[PDB]
Amino acid sequence: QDKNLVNVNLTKEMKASFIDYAMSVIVARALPDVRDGLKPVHRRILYGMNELGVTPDKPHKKSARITGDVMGKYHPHGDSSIYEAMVRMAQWWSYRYMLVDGHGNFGSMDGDSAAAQRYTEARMSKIALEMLRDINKNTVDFVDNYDANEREPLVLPARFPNLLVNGATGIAVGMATNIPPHNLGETIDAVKLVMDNPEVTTKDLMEVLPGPDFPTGALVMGKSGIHKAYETGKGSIVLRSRTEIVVTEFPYMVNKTKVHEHIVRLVQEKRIEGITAVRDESNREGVFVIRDASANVILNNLFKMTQMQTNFGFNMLAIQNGIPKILSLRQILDAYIEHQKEVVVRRTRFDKEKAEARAHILEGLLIALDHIDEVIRIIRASETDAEAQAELMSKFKLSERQSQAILDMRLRRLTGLERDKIQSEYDDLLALIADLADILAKPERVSQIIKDELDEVKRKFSDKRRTELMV
Amino acid sequence: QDKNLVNVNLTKEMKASFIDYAMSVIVARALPDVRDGLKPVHRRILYGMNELGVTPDKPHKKSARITGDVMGKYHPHGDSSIYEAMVRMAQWWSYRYMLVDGHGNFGSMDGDSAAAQRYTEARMSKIALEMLRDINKNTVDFVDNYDANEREPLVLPARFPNLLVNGATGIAVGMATNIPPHNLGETIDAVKLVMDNPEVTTKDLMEVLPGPDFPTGALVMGKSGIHKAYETGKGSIVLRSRTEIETTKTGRERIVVTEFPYMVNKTKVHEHIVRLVQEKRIEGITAVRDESNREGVRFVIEVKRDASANVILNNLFKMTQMQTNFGFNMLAIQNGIPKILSLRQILDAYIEHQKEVVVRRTRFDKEKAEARAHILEGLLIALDHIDEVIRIIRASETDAEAQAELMSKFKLSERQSQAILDMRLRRLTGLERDKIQSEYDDLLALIADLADILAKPERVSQIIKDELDEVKRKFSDKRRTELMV
Amino acid sequence: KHMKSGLEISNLPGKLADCSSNNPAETELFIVEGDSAGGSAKSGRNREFQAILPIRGKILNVEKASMDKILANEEIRSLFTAMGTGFGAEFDVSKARYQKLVLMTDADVDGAHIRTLLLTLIYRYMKPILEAGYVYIAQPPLGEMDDHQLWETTMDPEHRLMARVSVDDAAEADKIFDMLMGDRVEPRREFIEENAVY
Amino acid sequence: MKSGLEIPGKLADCSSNNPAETELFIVEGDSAGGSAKSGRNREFQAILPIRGKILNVEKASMDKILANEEIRSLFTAMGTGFGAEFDVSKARYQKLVLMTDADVDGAHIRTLLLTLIYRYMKPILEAGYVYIAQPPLGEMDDHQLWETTMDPEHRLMARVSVDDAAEADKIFDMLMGDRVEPRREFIEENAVYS
DNA sequence: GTTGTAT
DNA sequence: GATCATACAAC
DNA sequence: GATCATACAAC
DNA sequence: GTTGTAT
Numbered sequence A: 001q002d003k004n005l006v007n008v009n010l011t012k013e014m015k016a017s018f019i020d021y022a023m024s025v026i027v028a029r030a031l032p033d034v035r036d037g038l039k040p041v042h043r044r045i046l047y048g049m050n051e052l053g054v055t056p057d058k059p060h061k062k063s064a065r066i067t068g069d070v071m072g073k074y075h076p077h078g079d080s081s082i083y084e085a086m087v088r089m090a091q092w093w094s095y096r097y098m099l100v101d102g103h104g105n106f107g108s109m110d111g112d113s114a115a116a117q118r119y120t121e122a123r124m125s126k127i128a129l130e131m132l133r134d135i136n137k138n139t140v141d142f143v144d145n146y147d148a149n150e151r152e153p154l155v156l157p158a159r160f161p162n163l164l165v166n167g168a169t170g171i172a173v174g175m176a177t178n179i180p181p182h183n184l185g186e187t188i189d190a191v192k193l194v195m196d197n198p199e200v201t202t203k204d205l206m207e208v209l210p211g212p213d214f215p216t217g218a219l220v221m222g223k224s225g226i227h228k229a230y231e232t233g234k235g236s237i238v239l240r241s242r243t244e245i246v247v248t249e250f251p252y253m254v255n256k257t258k259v260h261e262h263i264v265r266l267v268q269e270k271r272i273e274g275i276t277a278v279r280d281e282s283n284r285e286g287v288f289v290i291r292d293a294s295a296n297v298i299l300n301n302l303f304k305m306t307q308m309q310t311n312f313g314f315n316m317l318a319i320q321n322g323i324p325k326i327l328s329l330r331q332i333l334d335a336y337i338e339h340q341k342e343v344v345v346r347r348t349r350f351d352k353e354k355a356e357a358r359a360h361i362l363e364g365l366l367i368a369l370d371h372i373d374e375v376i377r378i379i380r381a382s383e384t385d386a387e388a389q390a391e392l393m394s395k396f397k398l399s400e401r402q403s404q405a406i407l408d409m410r411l412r413r414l415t416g417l418e419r420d421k422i423q424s425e426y427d428d429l430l431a432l433i434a435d436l437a438d439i440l441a442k443p444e445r446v447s448q449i450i451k452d453e454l455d456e457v458k459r460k461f462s463d464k465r466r467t468e469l470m471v
Numbered sequence B: 001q002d003k004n005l006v007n008v009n010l011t012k013e014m015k016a017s018f019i020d021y022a023m024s025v026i027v028a029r030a031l032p033d034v035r036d037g038l039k040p041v042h043r044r045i046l047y048g049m050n051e052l053g054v055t056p057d058k059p060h061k062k063s064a065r066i067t068g069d070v071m072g073k074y075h076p077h078g079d080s081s082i083y084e085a086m087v088r089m090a091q092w093w094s095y096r097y098m099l100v101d102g103h104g105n106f107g108s109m110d111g112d113s114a115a116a117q118r119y120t121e122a123r124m125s126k127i128a129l130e131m132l133r134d135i136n137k138n139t140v141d142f143v144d145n146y147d148a149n150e151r152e153p154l155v156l157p158a159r160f161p162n163l164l165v166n167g168a169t170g171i172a173v174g175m176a177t178n179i180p181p182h183n184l185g186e187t188i189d190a191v192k193l194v195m196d197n198p199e200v201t202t203k204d205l206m207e208v209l210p211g212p213d214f215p216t217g218a219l220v221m222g223k224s225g226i227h228k229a230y231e232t233g234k235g236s237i238v239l240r241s242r243t244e245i246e247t248t249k250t251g252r253e254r255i256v257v258t259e260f261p262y263m264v265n266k267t268k269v270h271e272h273i274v275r276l277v278q279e280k281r282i283e284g285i286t287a288v289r290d291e292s293n294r295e296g297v298r299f300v301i302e303v304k305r306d307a308s309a310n311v312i313l314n315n316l317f318k319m320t321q322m323q324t325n326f327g328f329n330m331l332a333i334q335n336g337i338p339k340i341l342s343l344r345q346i347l348d349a350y351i352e353h354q355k356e357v358v359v360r361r362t363r364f365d366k367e368k369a370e371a372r373a374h375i376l377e378g379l380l381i382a383l384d385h386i387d388e389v390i391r392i393i394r395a396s397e398t399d400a401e402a403q404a405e406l407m408s409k410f411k412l413s414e415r416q417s418q419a420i421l422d423m424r425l426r427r428l429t430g431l432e433r434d435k436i437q438s439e440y441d442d443l444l445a446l447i448a449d450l451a452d453i454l455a456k457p458e459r460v461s462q463i464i465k466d467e468l469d470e471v472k473r474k475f476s477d478k479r480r481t482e483l484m485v
Numbered sequence C: 001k002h003m004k005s006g007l008e009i010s011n012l013p014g015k016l017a018d019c020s021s022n023n024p025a026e027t028e029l030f031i032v033e034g035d036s037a038g039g040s041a042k043s044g045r046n047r048e049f050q051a052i053l054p055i056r057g058k059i060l061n062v063e064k065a066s067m068d069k070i071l072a073n074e075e076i077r078s079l080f081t082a083m084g085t086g087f088g089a090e091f092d093v094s095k096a097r098y099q100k101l102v103l104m105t106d107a108d109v110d111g112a113h114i115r116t117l118l119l120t121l122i123y124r125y126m127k128p129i130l131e132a133g134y135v136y137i138a139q140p141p142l143g144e145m146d147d148h149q150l151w152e153t154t155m156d157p158e159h160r161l162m163a164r165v166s167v168d169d170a171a172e173a174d175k176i177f178d179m180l181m182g183d184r185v186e187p188r189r190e191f192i193e194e195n196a197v198y
Numbered sequence D: 001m002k003s004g005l006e007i008p009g010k011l012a013d014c015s016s017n018n019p020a021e022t023e024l025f026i027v028e029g030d031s032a033g034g035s036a037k038s039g040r041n042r043e044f045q046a047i048l049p050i051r052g053k054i055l056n057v058e059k060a061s062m063d064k065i066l067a068n069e070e071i072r073s074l075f076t077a078m079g080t081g082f083g084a085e086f087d088v089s090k091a092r093y094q095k096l097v098l099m100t101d102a103d104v105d106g107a108h109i110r111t112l113l114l115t116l117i118y119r120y121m122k123p124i125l126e127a128g129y130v131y132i133a134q135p136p137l138g139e140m141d142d143h144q145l146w147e148t149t150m151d152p153e154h155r156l157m158a159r160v161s162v163d164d165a166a167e168a169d170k171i172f173d174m175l176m177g178d179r180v181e182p183r184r185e186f187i188e189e190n191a192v193y194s
Numbered sequence E, H: 001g002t003t004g005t006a007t
Numbered sequence F, G: 001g002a003t004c005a006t007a008c009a010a011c
């Protein structure tokens, strides 16, 4: 028997509760950001490893160490949910361009799970570092964490088109997104091509970007789907296996073992003759071997009945401006480019403000070193550091900071070679402040800096095309 | 086949593999250290918590975080094993004096398991802070961690006898320890007693340390074993649930349990009684209701008319875990090896570890105090001769030459010279010296005092006693377990 | 007054911290998520008229689940076993063990989902219970909450704030479930897109 | 070589049917199983994870022994049979390698597995089919374990050979036996601490 | 069977 | 997230 | 540690 | 059935 009871209509609660879980699952779990092409977990694992200091140059850390933090700080969920995400970012078959470098068991192509976070340690991947470049130069907006006792970035700089390169997936609520991976180089080529001729067309963009490039390789039969996919954001494509009867490369998100098990089932059920044997002679250095049968007939059947040939349905759905949107190739490129521009500017402004600030305090030190005799005479006569600062500011026309900078001067910096050492630095800053000032004033440079810094990535991290397109 | 193959003798490998695991568990898992009364995982959790900065003053931190760094920096085992051990030392019924403060479902007496790490958050308990006091003043040796890229303490300072106070258990290989929790204040009174009168006897000690003081309370039957345990480290004690008969509103007897024995699960006994009542192994029970509230234990066994509650009571004491025995097996690691110690031996062990920690601190405090005053002497000379000093600096090209001159002109050490070179211009005010003077003067006193403590062993013990009285004065409880003949 | 006396067989679910009373007009059944909260409820629940029945994971969506799958689900099974009401051609509202079914899910979005899955079950296979005004919803001010915290805030009737689930138009009710929970995605997609403020 | 399509849940079997070259790796846990399974040469090398700590048969009721799921897996793998059905001439593997972790715990699992083999598979040990991996395990890549312990051309094995059965029988009884006092003495005797 | 660190 | 067998000693 | 069910969309 | 973040 309650005292303060209230009435709540069923339909009202249902609509309220559902929308609450729908929006939350959509714009904060299952769908990636059109910009950095990351979903909350992956973005938190990355920013995590970053703060943890598991950079590509530093040594690995035990996953329990990483998961423990990412959880106790940013991602308010289960270890399994995180460590599982971290494990996909370290599998060559999962990501076209891995975002983690782990040691130990991190699973297999045969569905074999990873080991315990007590046996596996990991760290950022070299290319992943590009996702964080200049993160500490106000290139990104930060927010409070669930605990409200920590801060995290809403997005990463993402110095490479992560979304398109690695892909996206997928299951949300009332909607699902499915984006295939692409070659690092080719993508960058598209990004630049757009920055050059905005009047470009789908056909033109496909000149430097054939289509998908899955980390497994294989083949994509047909091109008509790729086009409609890049134009509307929705389409379908077929993915076959590279064979010679031996199978060398299996399609995207396809398990060799499962195919093996299913092939065995089809063999013991009048579903295909010829099936003399079906082995898997796959090594740690490469991948599946399988009279009177023609094979070409039995081989053609396996691809049309089993999983050796699957269909990939384009459904490029991301989060742009807080809302989920079905974007096309162009819409995604323009969205990334704009995010890139914001970062170079933001970073440029950051350096700008620092240099100028540094020079201001540098101008004072010089003034002081020039009149060290009077400055010291002023301080010595001063009773409190408060008075000592007012005097210096009144005499040498200095600001509170400059004055404070002078009062915090170590004696060892009152030598001769010092003055000239500050001058040399100061002179260099004026040139820096003057160079940065031109970049913020000339939209053209920012664009060029982007192009340049991209080609540097394409030159350090681009692979050879794995997926051979057919017709 | 293979190329280079060796041959291993079954008996040979067996004895080797077993001896490895045997010692591994004994000195590095199962039994605790006589000094801080801790086992590897408990010590790694405490120290780890200290580093994470989750002190009594600071706010709690997600459990997964705590175990995450402890497993990644110190304890090379499963996550569960650490979180499990952490939760336990946060339960008022498992630890006589908890060493951890948690927030959320940390389990219940009825055997309930604490919530997932993703829900619970923890930190050190005010008292646990005594286990670490002066951890950073070189009072405890450190060693490389399993990874050889982190440094951890072999033992803790432990400013209160955590072995006797919280007990131990216990299963290893070839051996197993079992020590009952005691009352803080009492244990301290025992430690202080053995310090002031070395000729004290188990009897004399038991005058201030009557016996076990379990967290739940209950009763102890027969002190004969208690004196046997304290004098030999081995002994048997009888534990019984504190009970009381009540008269229902209808007018029949009602058996009420308020304090089950140590390590006895209420629910487990509730299920045990039902299995016996429905099995005709015990007749006369009208009902068994658990009326325990988040503010006390109330386990009621109402008897039927024409039935002696007492008769049923004793039957319960004899058949259920409502009455059990406690196997005193006071076994702890001492000098690297496992030993069955008496009460006195465990105290003597604590008092010693206590003397060492204090001295080291005193020394550490002295070496620092002096090192400072040395720099203060330099800064003074410098602030007395600022003109000539600044002259030497400015007239010098390289700092190496500037320092070399200052040392040579003012007769200063390399340490002193650098100090002068690093002085901020703000330090060259009028009021600055009189400040540096006061500090310096204060240091001469401290160094005098500290120099004395290290000269007089009488002061070290007195410092210990005084500091115990404070721990006692701040964390001591009232006895919970009633001892009776 | 009438109350249990142990020794009883009951044969109820392994979980379910059943209370002491036997008056289906005072006792309460709390459907919690996970034992992380169940444990907080179980201990500090006034084990006299409040029973705790932990539901693990996400309850099956009856709107998209084959009846053969509904009769196989142990999670929904334990629930009907706890009420003692009956299923379909046996549902006797006059034989329910509790006249107060309090849904107490986590204060997170995921909690709001389980809350959604439950109500569909209660409205699709226990309508009589809702039509009798037994289904209530806890209004917290859960795993990261202590004993005294849970009780003093939402479990104590002297200070707790509950909400009675009332149905207005059964026609509008059958539609809301057919849209939000129905196998139809387009409608649900349109709904979300129409009634959502980012 | 087999042909598949034939018919334990775990245990990644090889591809050959020649119990003269084939090998079974008994590793502890699926943590070390994946690493071992992902670079084993699935032709004459099969893996079988021993989940948890093996039951000590030198102190177990022959009823609980015939109950243990782990011991049934290892026997089911071998294909030898049990007790009166022991058929060494039917072993599916001429090389059983004990590849436990390099920690103390693994060392323990070594003794358990040995007691199990010596007591209820003596014919196997008597024939020299039992070896012991010699690592320098989940914290190890595929090529790391393959290029260190699993590759025949390299690696280093330890053939288990019994000399004085009486001494062997005595040892197990002492260490893995029921009597504890004798075991302690052994600890006190052959053990240097400080 | 139960206890508490481990696989 | 919950549960499942096991080592080890002593009772 | 391994294993169990389930929502959610889309082939 | 399977994909991947979730309870």
Ligand SMILES: C[C@H]1COc2c(N3CCN(C)CC3)c(F)cc3c(=O)c(C(=O)O)cn1c23
Pocket (backbone or CB within 6 Å): A078, A080, A081, C034, C056, C057, C058, C074, C075, F001, G004, G005, H007
């Ligand atoms: C939240 C709990 C709910 O229960 C779970 C499962 N069950 C659902 C109910 N069934 C009766 C028994 C099995 C399950 F199979 C897997 C998981 C799981 O992987 C998981 C996690 O955090 O990673 C968490 N949970 C799981």
Ligand SMILES: C[C@H]1COc2c(N3CCN(C)CC3)c(F)cc3c(=O)c(C(=O)O)cn1c23
Pocket (backbone or CB within 6 Å): B078, B080, B081, D051, D052, D053, D069, D070, E007, F004, F005, G001
């Ligand atoms: C190391 C693994 C070994 O397997 C385990 C168990 N089994 C042993 C084998 N049985 C066939 C199935 C059950 C078990 F029942 C419990 C645990 C457990 O609690 C645990 C942990 O780290 O907390 C770890 N493990 C366990």
Ligand SMILES: [Mg+2]
Pocket (backbone or CB within 6 Å): A080
């Ligand atoms: Mg899971």
Ligand SMILES: [Mg+2]
Pocket (backbone or CB within 6 Å): B080
């Ligand atoms: Mg366990």
